[PDB]
Amino acid sequence: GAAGAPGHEPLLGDPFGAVLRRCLDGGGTRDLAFEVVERDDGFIIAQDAGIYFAPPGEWPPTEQWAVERARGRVLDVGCGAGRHGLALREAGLDVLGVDSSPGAAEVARERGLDVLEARFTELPARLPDGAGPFDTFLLLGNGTGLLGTPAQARETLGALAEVAAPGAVILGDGLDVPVPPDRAAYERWNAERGRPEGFVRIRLRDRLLVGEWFDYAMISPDDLGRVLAGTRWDLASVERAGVRYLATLRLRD
Amino acid sequence: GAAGAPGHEPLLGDPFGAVLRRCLDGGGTRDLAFEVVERDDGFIIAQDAGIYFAPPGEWPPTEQWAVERARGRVLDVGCGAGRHGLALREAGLDVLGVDSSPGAAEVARERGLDVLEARFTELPARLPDGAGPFDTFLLLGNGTGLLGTPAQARETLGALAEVAAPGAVILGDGLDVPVPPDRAAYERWNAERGRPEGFVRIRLRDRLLVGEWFDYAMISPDDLGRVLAGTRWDLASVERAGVRYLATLRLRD
Ligand SMILES: CN1CCCC[C@H]1C(=O)N[C@@H]1CO[C@@]2(C[C@H]3OC(=O)c4cc5c(O)c6c(cc5c(c43)O2)[C@@H](O)CCC6=O)[C@]1(O)Cn1cnc2[nH]c(N)nc(=O)c21
Ligand SMILES: CN1CCCC[C@H]1C(=O)N[C@@H]1CO[C@@]2(C[C@H]3OC(=O)c4cc5c(O)c6c(cc5c(c43)O2)[C@@H](O)CCC6=O)[C@]1(O)Cn1cnc2[nH]c(N)nc(=O)c21
Ligand SMILES: [Cl-]
Ligand SMILES: [Cl-]
Ligand SMILES: [Cl-]
Ligand SMILES: [Cl-]
Ligand SMILES: [Cl-]
Ligand SMILES: [Cl-]
Ligand SMILES: [Cl-]
Ligand SMILES: [Cl-]
Numbered sequence: 001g002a003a004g005a006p007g008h009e010p011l012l013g014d015p016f017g018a019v020l021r022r023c024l025d026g027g028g029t030r031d032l033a034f035e036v037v038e039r040d041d042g043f044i045i046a047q048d049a050g051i052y053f054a055p056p057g058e059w060p061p062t063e064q065w066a067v068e069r070a071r072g073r074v075l076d077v078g079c080g081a082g083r084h085g086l087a088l089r090e091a092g093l094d095v096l097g098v099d100s101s102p103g104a105a106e107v108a109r110e111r112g113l114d115v116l117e118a119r120f121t122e123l124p125a126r127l128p129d130g131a132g133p134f135d136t137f138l139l140l141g142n143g144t145g146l147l148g149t150p151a152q153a154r155e156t157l158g159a160l161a162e163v164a165a166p167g168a169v170i171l172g173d174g175l176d177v178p179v180p181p182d183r184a185a186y187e188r189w190n191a192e193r194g195r196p197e198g199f200v201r202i203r204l205r206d207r208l209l210v211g212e213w214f215d216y217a218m219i220s221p222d223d224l225g226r227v228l229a230g231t232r233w234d235l236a237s238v239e240r241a242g243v244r245y246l247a248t249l250r251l252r253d
Numbered sequence: 254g255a256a257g258a259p260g261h262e263p264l265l266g267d268p269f270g271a272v273l274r275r276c277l278d279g280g281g282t283r284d285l286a287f288e289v290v291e292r293d294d295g296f297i298i299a300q301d302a303g304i305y306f307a308p309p310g311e312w313p314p315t316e317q318w319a320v321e322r323a324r325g326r327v328l329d330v331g332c333g334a335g336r337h338g339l340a341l342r343e344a345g346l347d348v349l350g351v352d353s354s355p356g357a358a359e360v361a362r363e364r365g366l367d368v369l370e371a372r373f374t375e376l377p378a379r380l381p382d383g384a385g386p387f388d389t390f391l392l393l394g395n396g397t398g399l400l401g402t403p404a405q406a407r408e409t410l411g412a413l414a415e416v417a418a419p420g421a422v423i424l425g426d427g428l429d430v431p432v433p434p435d436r437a438a439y440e441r442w443n444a445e446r447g448r449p450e451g452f453v454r455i456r457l458r459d460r461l462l463v464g465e466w467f468d469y470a471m472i473s474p475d476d477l478g479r480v481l482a483g484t485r486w487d488l489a490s491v492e493r494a495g496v497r498y499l500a501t502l503r504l505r506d
Contacts, residue, residue, distance in 0.1 A: 001463075002255040003456075008294035008442050023499065030280075034299035036289055044458040046287035046299045155339035182461065189261050205297040210254075 015206035017042045017103015019049045020081050024107050028081075040213065041186065041203040055122060059083070062246040065239065066171035072135025073165065079115060082108030084140050094193035096131060098123060111213070120156040123163055123185035133165035139172035144247060145217040149196050150227045152215065161232045161251060170233065170249040175218035175244050198223060221245060268459035270356015272302045273334050277360050281334075286359060293454040293466065294439065306497060307335035312336070314498040316393045318492065319424035325388025330396070335361030337393050342366060349384060351376060373409040375415055386418035388445065392425035398470040402449050403480045405468065414431035414485045423486065423502040428471035430496050451476060463502060474498060 004010065004082035019033045023080045028034040037045050039140040056064055067087055072094075076085035079097030081104060086253065088095045097115040099105050137160055139147070147153035160170065179187070187197055188216055195201075198219055204211040219227070221238045224247060233249040257263065271415050272286045279285040283303035290298050304452065310316055320340055325347075329338035332350030334357060341348045350368040358370040371379045390413055392400070400406035413423065432440070440450055448454075451472055457464040472480070474491045477500060480489055486502040 002257065003291050004255065004295040005293075005294050007437075010295040010297075031283055031301045031303075034287055034296050034301075036299055038256050040258075042255050042257040042263040042458075042463075043461050044289050046264075046289055048284045048287075048301070050284075177460065186261075197313070205295075207298070208294065208296050210295075 004012045010205065010208045010210040012212065013209035014101055015204040015209040015211050016100040016102045017105075017107065018209055019204075019206050020052055020101075020104050020107045022112065023049040023053060024081070030097065036205045037202050038113050038205050039091070039186075041189070043186075043200075046181045050084060051130070054083060056083075056087050060244055061241045064175040065171065066138060066140055066244050069171060070136045074136045075132065075134040075139045075160075075163070076113075076119060076139065076140075077160070078141070078146055079108055079113065080141060082102055082111050082113035082115065084138050085113045086111055087090060091218065096134075121159045127163060131169070132163045134160075134163055135165045137164070137168065137170040137172075139174070140169055141176050142218065143172045144170055144174035144219050144224055147227075148215045149199055153227050154231050157228070157231045157233055164251050166251075168251045169236075170251075171246060172249060173244060173246045174221070174224065174247060176220045176240075177218050177241055255407050257484065263458065263461045263463040265465065266462035267354055267356045268457040268462040268464050269352040270360065270461050271462055273305055273354075273360045273455075275300040276306060277334070289458045290437075290455050291458050294442070296439075304337060307336060309336075309340050313426070313497055314494045315426040315492070318499050319391060319393055319426065322424060323389045323391065326385055327389045327391065327452075328385065328387040328413075328416070329391045329393075329468075330373060331392065331399055332361055332366065333357055333394060335366035335368065337391050338366045339364055349387075352466070354386070359471045361408050370405075374412045376412045381426075386414045386416045386421070387413075387416055388421050390417070390421065390423040390425075392423055394426070395428050395471065396425045397427035397472050397477055400480075401468045402452055406480050407484050410481070410484045410486055417504050421504045422489075423504075424499060425502060426497060426499045427474070427477065427497055429473045429493075429498060430471050451455060474500060 001024045019035050023033040030048050033049040035047045035049050074088055074093055074095040079085050079099050081186040086098045097108055097113050100119050100191055102117055105115045108115045131210050152224040199215045199217045201213050203213045204217050232252055236248045236250040238245050258316050266367050270286050276324045282387040283301050285304040288300045288302050303490040327341055327346055329350040330353050332338050338348040338350045350361055350366050353372050355370055357370045359367045369477045400409055452468045452470045454466050485505055489501045489503040491500050
C-alpha cells in the first residue's frame with residue numbers, strides 16, 4: 001500500500017543535498033544523516049551520509065588508488081560533498097568539481113572545493129574558457145554506474161571528451177557484484193520493459209522531499225567495454241579489490 | 254509520484270527483524286544496516302541499526318540510568334535486539350524480553366536473551382505461570398512513544414499491571430522535542446482526521462518488505478500523565494537529559 005494523500009505527500013526537490021547539509025552541520029561524522037534510495041518497485045536501501053565526509057584513509061581502496069594516480073588538471077565528475085577533489089586540492093593540484101545537486105555543490109564549496117553546478121552533458125557550455133582542458137577525470141563512488149544507461153553514458157563521455165586535454169584519462173570505479181534471486185527478478189522486469197540489463201531506476205527520499213528518477217547500475221568491466229564502443233574512450237586497465245574495480249579509460253582522437 | 258507496479262511492489266513482512274539480522278551477521282557494528290521509517294504522508298527518516306547492538310556506555314543517559322536502577326524480576330518490554338536485557342542478564346538479574354517482531358526475537362535469542370514473541374496485550378495469556386510477577390518493566394528506546402495512542406497505551410499498561418509484582422515500577426524513557434513547522438503541519442492533519450495530537454502513523458521499509466502501520470509519538474511528561482489517568486500507574490518522577498527523559502511509573506492496587 002502506497003503512502004501519501006493529496007495535500008500530504010512528498011514534493012520534488014533536492015534530498016541528496018539536504019542530507020549532505022544536515023550531515024555537515026552536525027560535524028560531518030557518521031550516524032548523523034542517511035541517504036535513502038527507493039527503486040521503482042519500492043525496494044528501499046540506505047547509506048550513511050558520513051561516507052561523503054570521510055578522509056582518504058577510510059575510502060574503498062579503488063578510490064584511494066584513483067586519487068594517488070591523479071595528475072594535471074583534474075575534473076571531479078559528480079563530486080558529491082567534494083571528498084576526492086578536496087584531497088587533491090590539499091595535495092596541490094588544480095581541481096574543479098561538478099555536481100547536479102545544488103545542495104551538494106554548496107556543501108562542497110563550503111568545504112573549500114570549486115564546484116560547477118551542472119548536468120555533465122552541459123559541461124562544454126557552462127565551463128569558463130580558462131578552465132581545463134582536463135588531464136584527469138574522476139568518476140568515483142561507483143562512478144561508472146552513475147553514467148546512466150548506455151545512451152546517456154555515451155552522451156556524458158562525449159561531453160568529457162570535448163573538455164579533455166590530449167592524453168587525458170578517466171579514473172572510474174565500479175561494482176562487479178553477484179546477482180541474488182531478488183535482483184534477477186528485477187532484471188526480468190527490465191527485459192519486459194525493454195530496459196538495459198544491469199540498470200535500476202531509483203530516486204532519493206528524505207523527509208518530505210523526493211528526487212527525480214535516475215538510472216543506476218553495477219556494471220562489470222566487460223559491460224563497460226561495450227558502452228565505450230562508439231566513443232573516443234578505450235578501457236585501458238582494470239584493477240580489482242573484491243567486488244570493486246578501478247578502470248582507466250584513455251582518450252583517443 | 255508513488256513507486257511500485259502490480260507484481261513489482263513491496264510485500265507485507267518483518268523489515269525490522271530483517272534489518273537487525275543483517276546487522277548482526279555483519280558483526281553488529283555501525284554502518285552495516287539501516288532502519289528506514291516512512292510516515293503516512295511519505296515522510297522518510299532512517300536510523301543506524303547498530304544502535305540496537307551498542308554497549309551500555311554508548312546508550313543515551315536515560316537508558317543507562319534505567320538499567321542502573323533495575324531490580325528484581327525484569328521484563329524488557331519491546332526488547333529489540335536485546336541490548337538492555339542482555340546487560341542486566343550479564344549483571345546477574347532474572348530478565349525476560351518481549352518483542353512483536355519474529356526476526357528481532359530470534360536475534361535477541363541468538364545473543365543470549367530469553368524472549369517471548371508476542372504483542373504486549375497478549376502477555377498475561379502467553380507468559381508461563383513460572384515467569385514473573387515482574388518488579389521492573391523496561392520501556393526503553395523512546396519507550397513511552399511506542400505505547401501507541403492513549404487507547405492502545407492504556408490497554409498495554411493494563412496487561413503489564415496483570416503480570417506485575419506488588420510495588421512494581423516501569424522505567425520508561427521518552428522525547429520532549431520542539432515542533433518544527435513541518436511537524437506542525439502534520440499535527441494539523443491529525444486534527445482534521447480526529448487523531449490524537451503528538452502521534453505519527455509510520456511503518457518500516459527494507460528492500461521489498463514493508464511493515465504494518467503503527468502509531469508513534471514523542472510524548473512530553475505532562476501528556477504522559479494524562480494517559481496514566483484511568484490506569485493503575487502513577488507518574489512518580491521524571492529526570493531529564495536534554496530532550497530525553499526517564500519516567501518512573503509506580504503501580505498501585
Ligand atoms: C541523528 N539525530 C541527531 C541528534 C540526536 C538524535 C538524532 C535524531 O534526531 N533522531 C533519532 C533517529 O531515529 C529517531 C528514532 C526512530 O525510531 C523510529 O521508528 C522513528 C520514527 C520517527 C518519525 O516518524 C519522525 C521523526 C523522528 C523519528 C525517529 C525514529 O527519530 C521526526 O524527527 C520527524 C517527524 C516524524 O514523523 C531518533 O532516535 C529520535 N530522536 C532522538 N533525539 C532526538 N532529537 C530531536 N530534536 N528529534 C528526534 O527525532 C530525536
Ligand atoms: C553495507 N554493505 C556491506 C558490505 C560493503 C558494502 C555495503 C553495501 O552492500 N552497499 C553500499 C550501500 O550503498 C550502495 C551505494 C548506494 O548509492 C545509491 O544511490 C544506491 C542504490 C542501490 C540500489 O538501487 C540497489 C542495491 C544497492 C544500492 C546502493 C546505493 O548500494 C542492491 O544492493 C540491491 C538492488 C538495488 O536496486 C553501496 O555503497 C554499494 N556496494 C558497495 N559494495 C557492495 N557489495 C554488494 N554485494 N552489494 C552492494 O550494493 C555494494
Ligand atoms: Cl554506509
Ligand atoms: Cl600533477
Ligand atoms: Cl565554486
Ligand atoms: Cl541505452
Ligand atoms: Cl542512528
Ligand atoms: Cl536485583
Ligand atoms: Cl527464548
Ligand atoms: Cl486514543
